[PDB]
């Protein structure tokens, strides 16, 4: 065993009430077919069978979820929320790391059609288009990190989505010193060669 | 049978609008000039007769010697409206004529 | 069970059933809802000769009521001669008699067929500068046909439309042409060619053939009109839900308060609109005491599809108080309009927005349609102003030469009303 | 570029010191 | 005439220093990290260690002339002439190699945006590319200087 | 030169040109392309005998063939008289004589007008399952008719269509119908009606109406206010476009006129909004005279995102014209506000909607934003109305004691403006 | 002068429908009693004259001692259609008379 | 960074130039 990790079939944590989601976890060592174990809200669930399923998500089917293989540890809890809105902001990897991609989506209740979707980052507009479109950053940065929210038009009425919040977390400083170390080596070679050779010249005169 | 048989004359009056507005459905059929004062009154709705809610007065003569009757079919206004058409049949001779009454 | 007042309704043989060449017409009156068996039925055929006969009442086992049909037979112009049936019940009362006059044969008019055709858009991709609407009434029984055009439920000037008639043989057909601007048509206002003809009326409506994207439900919360809240002292707020399609499912509307205290019994009305949608109006009679103390009310609207229940709230608005100032103006005589005049009223400098305006003549309030008023707007300084306009005909001021403009407002100290009298001729 | 700036300044100072030492030893040689 | 050889031992020492610098500008990289793993296409000669000959050539170019500084032999003169010709060729070779390396480094920086996107691998690539470019430039310059110095021996006989 | 048979054609003065009461009507026959100078011309005017005259032959400039005009003058019913002209050429042949019959009003040409009317959708904005297109032709002389309907340039069976004809006086009308499925119409495929007349045939094309809002982008076209149209004499019209998604492109906004005449140069301006949206505004100076003659302008927009142009026509409002009536009043003094006053000007009974107002003191117009004016409201009778109010300080009415309420309206007298005087303290 | 001066009388006949359909456009103006035989005949389109397609006939006398002539403006139907109107200006005895004829 | 690297290369060039200049003095001390 290695460390069991969970994954959501639709990568988004935030879901609408009545929206299905199935989350399953595996350390890539499903060799013993030993029925894994699940906890949520620090309770015990009777679904030893892997691939936990949430069908018709209710307001009580949200919470911290953990799984433990037959002997291995339980691993980190992936949270879950369920909302009842018109527009929902769904982000994949809400706590993604800097080098990694990013992705956002403005879901409309019951798959209704949103128009004039504007994405706001930190209270300053970011992109406008005539219909739904997804923001899709391919290599996060330390500057694209802050509360977002989309604005849309459903049934020709203006609606807004409660804000999300993305955050980006950061090289070998030793390598940078080494490159300065190499620069110092070259400079010292030149300076010492010059001064010491001149000193030998003086001692030879 | 002391007098020659008289062909019944049946007139079907469509239900009154004011009476219908009062949640009452009444279909009136007046039978007059019928020497054979022994007939059966039947109220038919759509394609089949409506026996329920139909009452016919006993045949009698009012200074005419002919059996005249007032067959009234009573039913809820919704039931009458559902029926495509109303028919009143008086069975007293071999040439019975059915009077047709409809809301419009 | 108790005595019941008998109800008598006419009933006559159908005109189609009655032979055209058969002058004799048999009709009658059916009397029901009279518990006492005895009954007196009187049939009058007027000038046309008529004979009235009575038959035993037919008991109704379903409800216990007795139904008696009195048959009147007339000869000659029986249909043209009115038949009067009077039914009285002696046990009920000496004067408890109901008399109804009706004709055995009723006038029948073919319902004219109305269609609306539109000026075909320019074949390239667009419309001409002006759009024509042709409202055509097809074959119908000739008569004083009246054609009108409703600017979204409101009749506009007839001159804008042009009406013409045609008579093919004995069959009549009418054509009405109405021209509107391109901006008018593009503004998406429903236009209805309501048709009025002998008997009843018929109508058809048209609007710009827009795409499929319904407008979506919405709600609005009223407020007690000061007239009701101060003169009648019977305030009633209203929750108006509009744009909900007449399908899918109904809407549940709940009346709550800030304190959650018991609410009165609200009254709900559902109405279908010409623009294709349904509307709901719920009136809640609030207590004057609740409003004076600013007790907030609340309308909560739930729909089986809406993610969230729509919320609306109302309460006595807070701000400084200043009584209104009233001025009355009478228009001097204008050439060519000597027989009619116009009066104006200016109400200004009142702090809280809501206000009521009345036009009193002969110490009696006139119909509200007789005048027009502007919604309060924020004066340049502090306050509000409103202009009221009234139109008067000759005889109207001939009876009396003095009208009154009255402003009913909570700020007015004496009785929450201030009146000013104006006479056309000084 | 704090580290880079410090390295650049140190390199410049070292170069100036080396040039001054070269001048000193050159004076020692040529003068004799 | 005699001026070109003014320096034969000085030219020898300078050529030795130039060759040593040309080699060392990439020897540390070759002894530090796998240059072949260097991404960004700036690893044209980092992993190969081509200067393994280049700088050496420069040194060799000087070496054949160095003997003429003290020995003063015609055979040393011919060796210096050959070494100077080889250094003249190697100067162009190293100049072209360094130009290619500089172009590759510019392309890699533009693609990865090294001005602001200084990732760990980006820093390693920058250091390795600098090492390789310095080695190539020093090797080319050593070839040129060795040829120039040995011109005196070439003219000697 | 080469000998050819002369061509003889009738030539008569137009009926309008020829006096109605004139007792003499002159027509004749002109022969052209007759190389031989000799020629025989004979004129006959039925039973009536007229005067016949001839003129020397003139060789045609193009070819030189002798051409001559023989003129016959008749008296009486010359318009209905038949003029027979026989022209022969002896050199051409011994019997090569051509006779042509013609009259002043022998015949003419009657080009009819055609237009297509479609089936207007239900008041809800939903197309009917079946759509009826009826193309009507009017003002055609009686004759053979061959109807046709080209769907996208192709014709389907005639059973889908039905043709009816009628005639009143001399004007003839024809109606050809056609029925299409809703899916076919939604397919956005152009159709056209045609009627074969004298071998040339006519064509009127119609197709599905465009959106008028390609992708939610909206355009608004303004109008020139009467104050500009007459007082400043520098009218302009503005085209605004909103909700554009920024890109590396530009909107090819242009202009035009109904007649295609030249248009002055126009400005342009693009603005970025906090919404990440882009607005574009353009302005075009206009000719006040042209505007009075109703030359309809039109703003046309284009973009890479939008799949179709976004055009917006404009013009002058039609309908009957009526001058406005203007009154002005001064609000009496009220305690506590002695140092200020209010002046109210009422304007009414002007059929056109557009009207501008201004307050003038010391013969110099008061600032635009110092007075409040409503929007026109239809009166119970005819003509709109508008109120306007201003506040005057003590000094303005103290140093000078006269205010002017001026209203600028299209039909307002030759000056197009009506003014009234107000004295605070007369 | 051998005879008193006579004011020329000019009558212009616009081409008929048959002439227009005949692939030709010929407009003929006949002038009678125009001095002794000296007169100027011009054909103009709208407000401008035509320097081509115009033929003039020398004055002739037929038992009248006067001058008779015919001016024929010949051109394609398109040329006549383009012109707003055809003006046949005849000047004789110091008097100029212009006749305006149009197909309409 | 890249500008710093180019500055390092220029510094190496300047150091090489200084060594070349001092080459004459070194030879004169040792050889001449
Ligand atoms: C929102 C959604 O798709 N819900 C589906 C439901 O429709 C389906 O019936 C069920 C299994 O059949 O799985 C879940
Ligand atoms: C004992 C039992 O039923 N186990 C079920 C199995 O039948 C099913 O196939 C699987 C996924 O479908 O989940 C588990
Ligand atoms: C079954 C149950 O207790 N569910 C709860 C849920 O109601 C609550 O909202 C959530 C806190 O986020 O914790 C969990
Ligand atoms: C990565 C991790 O947490 N590993 C722990 C390990 O240190 C511990 O000894 C063991 C005891 O059950 O549980 C697991
Ligand atoms: C799909 C995609 O773009 N993948 C790349 C990934 O391979 C790379 O490691 C990363 C570096 O920032 O950038 C991203
Ligand atoms: C406008 C659009 O294409 N939106 C896409 C949607 O189609 C897709 O199902 C979803 C999951 O990948 O991501 C987003
Ligand atoms: C870094 C940052 O601003 N984080 C925000 C926090 O300020 C805010 O109070 C909270 C509530 O939504 O959401 C998160
Ligand atoms: C936009 C729309 O179609 N809805 C209107 C609504 O605004 C209006 O209140 C109602 C009549 O009251 O008619 C409907
Ligand atoms: C999507 C949207 O509504 N954007 C609005 C636009 O409608 C409005 O016209 C403009 C200023 O007028 O400001 C922005």
């Amino acid at each position: 065993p290695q460390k069991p990790k969970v994954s959501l079939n639709p990568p988004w944590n935030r879901i609408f009430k009545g929206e299905n989601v199935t989350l399953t976890c595996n350390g890539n060592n499903f060799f013993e077919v030993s029925s894994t174990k699940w906890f949520h809200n620090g309770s015990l669930s009777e679904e030893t069978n892997s691939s936990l399923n949430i069908v018709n998500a209710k307001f009580e089917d949200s919470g911290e979820y953990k799984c433990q293989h037959q002997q291995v540890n339980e691993s980190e809890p992936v949270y879950l929320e369920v909302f009842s809105d018109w527009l929902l902001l769904q982000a994949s990897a809400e706590v993604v790391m800097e080098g990694q991609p990013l992705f956002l989506r403005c879901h409309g209740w019951r798959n209704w059609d949103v128009y004039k979707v504007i994405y706001y980052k930190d209270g300053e507009a970011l992109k406008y288009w005539y219909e739904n479109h997804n923001i899709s950053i391919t290599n996060a940065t330390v500057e694209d990190s802050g509360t977002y929210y989309c604005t849309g038009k459903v049934w020709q009425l203006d609606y807004e989505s409660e804000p999300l919040n993305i955050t980006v977390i950061k090289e070998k400083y030793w390598l940078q010193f080494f490159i300065p170390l190499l620069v110092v080596i070259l400079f010292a070679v030149d300076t010492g060669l010059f001064i010491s050779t001149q000193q030998q010249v003086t001692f030879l005169l | 049978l002391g007098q020659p048989k008289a062909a019944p004359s049946v007139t079907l009056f469509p239900p009154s609008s004011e009476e219908l507005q009062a949640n009452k459905a009444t279909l009136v059929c007046l039978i007059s000039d019928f020497y054979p004062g022994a007939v059966t009154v039947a109220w038919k709705a759509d394609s089949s007769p409506v026996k329920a809610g139909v009452e016919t007065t006993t045949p009698s003569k009012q200074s005419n010697n002919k059996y005249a009757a007032s067959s009234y079919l009573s039913l809820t206004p919704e039931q009458w409206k559902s029926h495509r058409s109303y028919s009143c049949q008086v069975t007293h001779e071999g040439s019975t004529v059915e009077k047709t009454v409809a809301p419009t | 069970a108790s005595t019941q007042s008998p109800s008598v309704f006419p009933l006559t043989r159908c005109c189609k059933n009655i032979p055209s060449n058969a002058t004799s017409v048999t009709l009658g009156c059916l009397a029901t809802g009279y518990f006492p068996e005895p009954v007196m039925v009187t049939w009058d055929t007027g000038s046309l000769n008529g004979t009235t006969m009575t038959l035993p009442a037919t008991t109704l086992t379903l409800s216990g009521h007795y139904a008696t049909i009195s048959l009147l037979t007339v000869s000659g112009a029986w249909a043209k001669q009115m038949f009067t049936c009077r039914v009285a019940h002696t046990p009920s009362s000496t004067d408890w008699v109901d008399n109804k006059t009706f004709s055995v044969c009723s006038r029948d008019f073919t319902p004219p067929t109305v269609k609306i055709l539109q000026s075909s858009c320019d074949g390239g991709g667009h419309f001409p500068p002006t759009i024509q609407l042709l409202c055509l009434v097809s074959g119908y029984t000739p008569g004083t046909i009246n054609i009108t055009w409703l600017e979204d439920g409101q009749v506009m000037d007839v001159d804008l439309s042009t009406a013409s008639t045609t008579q093919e043989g004995e069959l009549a057909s009418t054509q009405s042409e109405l021209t509107l601007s391109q901006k008018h048509w593009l503004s998406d206002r429903t236009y209805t060619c309501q048709v009025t003809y002998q008997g009843h009326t018929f109508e058809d409506s048209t609007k710009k053939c827009a795409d499929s994207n319904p407008r979506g439900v919405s709600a609005y919360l009223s407020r007690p009109s000061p007239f009701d809240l101060f003169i009648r002292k019977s305030p009633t707020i209203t929750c108006l839900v509009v744009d909900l399609a007449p399908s899918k499912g109904t809407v549940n509307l709940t009346w709550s308060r800030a304190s959650g205290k018991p609410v009165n019994h609200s009254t709900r009305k559902e109405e279908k609109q010409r623009n294709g949608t349904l509307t709901v109006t719920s009136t809640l009679p609030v207590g004057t005491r609740d409003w004076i103390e600013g007790e907030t009310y609340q309308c909560r609207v739930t729909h089986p599809h809406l993610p969230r229940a729509l919320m609306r709230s109302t309460t006595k608005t807070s701000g400084p108080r200043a009584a209104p100032e009233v001025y009355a103006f009478a228009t001097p005589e204008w050439p060519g309009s000597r027989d009619k005049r116009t009066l104006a009223c200016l109400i200004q400098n009142f702090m809280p927005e809501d206000i009521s305006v009345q036009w009193l003549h002969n110490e009696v309030q006139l119909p509200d349609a007789r005048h027009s008023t502007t919604q309060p707007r924020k004066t340049k300084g502090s306050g509000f102003f409103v202009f009221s306009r009234l139109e008067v005909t000759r005889a109207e001021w001939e009876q009396k030469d003095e009208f009154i403009c009255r402003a009913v407002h909570e700020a007015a100290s004496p009785s929450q009303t201030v009146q000013r009298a104006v006479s056309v001729n000084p | 570029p704090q580290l880079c700036y410090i390295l650049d300044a140190i390199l410049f100072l070292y170069g100036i010191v080396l040039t001054l030492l070269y001048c000193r030893l050159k004076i020692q040689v040529r003068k004799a | 005439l005699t001026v070109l050889k003014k320096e034969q031992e000085f030219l020898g020492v300078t050529q030795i220093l130039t060759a040593m610098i040309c080699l060392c500008f990439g020897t540390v990289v070759c002894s530090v990290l796998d240059i072949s793993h260097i991404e960004g296409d700036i690893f044209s000669s980092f992993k190969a260690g081509y200067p393994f000959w280049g700088a050496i050539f420069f040194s060799i170019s000087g070496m054949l002339s160095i003997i003429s500084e003290r020995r003063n032999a015609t055979y040393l003169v011919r060796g210096s002439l050959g070494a100077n010709t080889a250094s003249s060729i190697a100067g162009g070779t190293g100049i072209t190699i360094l130009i290619i390396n500089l172009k590759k480094s510019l392309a890699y920086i533009h693609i990865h945006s090294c001005q602001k996107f200084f990732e760990t691998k980006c820093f390693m690539a920058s250091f390795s590319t600098e090492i390789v470019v310095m080695m190539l430039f020093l090797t080319i310059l050593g070839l040129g200087s060795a040829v120039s110095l040995t011109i005196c021996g070439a003219g000697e006989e």
Side-chain angles (χ1 to χ4, degrees), chain A residues 1-170 180 188 192, chain B residues 2 4 6-8 14-15 22 25 36-38 42 45 49 52-53 59 68-69 77 94 102-103, chain C residues 1 6 10 19 22 28 31 33 36 38 46 50 56-57 64 67 76-77 79 88 91 106-426, chain D residues 1 9 15 32, chain E residues 12 19 26 40 48-49 51 54-55 62 73 79 82-83 86 90-92 94 107 125 142 144 146 153-155:
Chain A
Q2 145 59 69
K3 183 178 179 180
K5 193 48 48 194
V6 310
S7 310
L8 292 74
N9 169 13
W12 317 283
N13 317 326
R14 311 151 82 66
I15 45 163
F16 272 120
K17 195 206 175 294
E19 202 178 344
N20 298 342
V21 59
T22 182
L23 73 170
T24 194
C25 67
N26 55 2
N28 294 330
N29 284 117
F30 183 26
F31 50 80
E32 203 159 347
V33 187
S34 54
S35 300
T36 57
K37 204 174 283 188
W38 297 90
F39 307 77
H40 85 291
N41 283 11
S43 68
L44 284 70
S45 294
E46 191 46 288
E47 190 168 347
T48 60
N49 197 316
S50 177
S51 281
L52 173 61
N53 270 6
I54 315 298
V55 295
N56 182 40
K58 292 177 71 68
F59 275 80
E60 83 193 3
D61 291 338
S62 58
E64 64 92 22
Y65 282 88
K66 298 139 65 194
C67 65
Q68 188 177 292
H69 290 352
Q70 188 274 331
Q71 63 184 10
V72 183
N73 293 318
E74 65 203 3
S75 80
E76 301 300 335
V78 298
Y79 291 9
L80 193 86
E81 290 178 349
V82 310
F83 305 85
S84 184
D85 270 346
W86 276 280
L87 298 170
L88 180 78
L89 187 46
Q90 287 172 302
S92 182
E94 181 161 3
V95 73
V96 72
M97 184 173 88
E98 192 199 281
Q100 294 292 316
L102 189 47
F103 196 99
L104 282 85
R105 167 177 195 213
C106 194
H107 202 237
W109 168 266
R110 272 185 183 199
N111 265 344
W112 290 346
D113 277 303
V114 190
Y115 289 126
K116 316 272 201 73
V117 181
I118 293 154
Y119 285 97
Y120 290 99
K121 166 153 87 184
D122 295 291
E124 181 96 340
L126 194 147
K127 179 70 144 59
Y128 159 87
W129 199 241
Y130 309 112
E131 299 91 6
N132 289 318
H133 63 306
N134 297 338
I135 278 170
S136 158
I137 294 140
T138 45
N139 281 294
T141 63
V142 182
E143 65 271 16
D144 63 358
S145 306
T147 66
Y148 296 174
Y149 60 91
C150 53
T151 312
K153 264 196 172 57
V154 184
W155 306 137
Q156 322 179 2
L157 298 156
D158 291 331
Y159 296 124
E160 203 205 21
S161 84
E162 69 296 336
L164 199 69
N165 190 335
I166 311 312
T167 183
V168 175
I169 48 175
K170 324 311 161 312
Chain C
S106 181
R107 304 293 91 72
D108 297 322
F109 63 97
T110 182
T113 75
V114 182
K115 195 145 52 47
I116 316 295
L117 307 179
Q118 156 167 4
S119 74
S120 64
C121 79
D122 186 74
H126 302 82
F127 291 104
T130 57
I131 296 89
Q132 181 186 4
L133 300 173
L134 177 68
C135 168
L136 60 91
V137 189
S138 88
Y140 77 100
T141 306
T144 310
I145 192 73
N146 301 117
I147 314 299
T148 175
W149 281 75
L150 280 62
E151 172 58 56
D152 206 354
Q154 173 46 258
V155 174
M156 67 213 98
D157 58 278
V158 174
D159 63 74
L160 183 65
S161 87
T162 311
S164 297
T165 59
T166 303
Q167 310 309 316
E168 46 273 14
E170 294 299 334
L171 184 63
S173 299
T174 77
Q175 313 295 107
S176 279
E177 293 82 3
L178 200 164
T179 291
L180 304 102
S181 86
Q182 188 274 330
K183 170 158 52 46
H184 281 176
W185 186 251
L186 183 63
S187 180
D188 304 276
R189 302 211 280 275
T190 294
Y191 313 110
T192 289
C193 173
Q194 159 165 342
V195 180
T196 314
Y197 182 76
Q198 302 168 3
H200 283 46
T201 183
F202 317 83
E203 67 189 8
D204 283 335
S205 64
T206 62
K207 74 174 277 182
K208 184 210 178 305
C209 303
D211 68 347
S212 294
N213 171 259
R215 174 64 188 295
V217 181
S218 162
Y220 311 95
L221 200 62
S222 163
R223 178 181 298 170
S225 304
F227 178 48
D228 297 331
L229 178 138
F230 277 110
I231 304 310
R232 288 226 313 286
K233 302 161 270 286
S234 86
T236 74
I237 71 177
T238 286
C239 203
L240 161 55
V241 191
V242 295
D243 293 306
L244 65 93
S247 163
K248 294 147 184 154
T250 192
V251 67
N252 180 2
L253 189 142
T254 61
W255 274 118
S256 66
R257 322 172 43 165
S259 51
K261 298 295 187 290
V263 301
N264 294 259
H265 187 193
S266 84
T267 176
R268 156 162 155 163
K269 302 158 40 162
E270 167 179 351
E271 294 294 328
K272 286 184 61 43
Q273 292 305 275
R274 262 150 194 163
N275 60 7
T277 72
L278 191 67
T279 65
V280 186
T281 316
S282 159
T283 318
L284 166 56
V286 307
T288 185
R289 181 50 41 209
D290 292 328
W291 208 258
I292 298 315
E293 278 69 357
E295 203 277 357
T296 285
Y297 285 68
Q298 194 152 38
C299 183
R300 187 155 186 287
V301 175
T302 66
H303 198 84
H305 300 289
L306 287 175
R308 293 218 175 160
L310 301 160
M311 284 315 297
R312 314 289 158 196
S313 74
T314 187
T315 185
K316 178 190 76 169
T317 61
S318 45
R321 256 60 178 157
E325 300 169 299
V326 181
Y327 322 108
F329 302 140
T331 48
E333 157 161 354
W334 187 269
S337 297
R338 204 161 91 71
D339 291 337
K340 73 178 79 187
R341 307 289 283 284
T342 312
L343 282 72
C345 183
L346 168 60
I347 310 317
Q348 61 169 3
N349 291 290
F350 50 71
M351 271 315 327
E353 162 158 351
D354 56 81
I355 178 159
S356 158
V357 61
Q358 266 132 333
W359 268 114
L360 270 64
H361 173 44
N362 290 331
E363 65 268 5
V364 61
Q365 186 147 354
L366 299 157
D368 192 294
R370 285 292 307 287
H371 57 78
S372 177
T373 309
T374 62
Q375 87 201 11
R377 269 176 320 143
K378 186 70 192 295
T379 182
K380 61 184 76 182
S382 178
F384 289 99
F385 68 97
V386 297
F387 288 112
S388 177
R389 170 171 193 278
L390 173 66
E391 310 81 329
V392 295
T393 66
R394 184 153 275 291
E396 271 166 340
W397 64 84
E398 290 277 26
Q399 288 99 23
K400 209 180 175 68
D401 192 5
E402 327 191 313
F403 295 169
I404 309 93
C405 194
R406 284 205 311 132
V408 171
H409 198 256
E410 55 265 35
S413 69
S415 303
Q416 293 82 18
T417 199
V418 289
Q419 66 182 357
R420 293 212 82 75
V422 68
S423 290
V424 169
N425 290 318

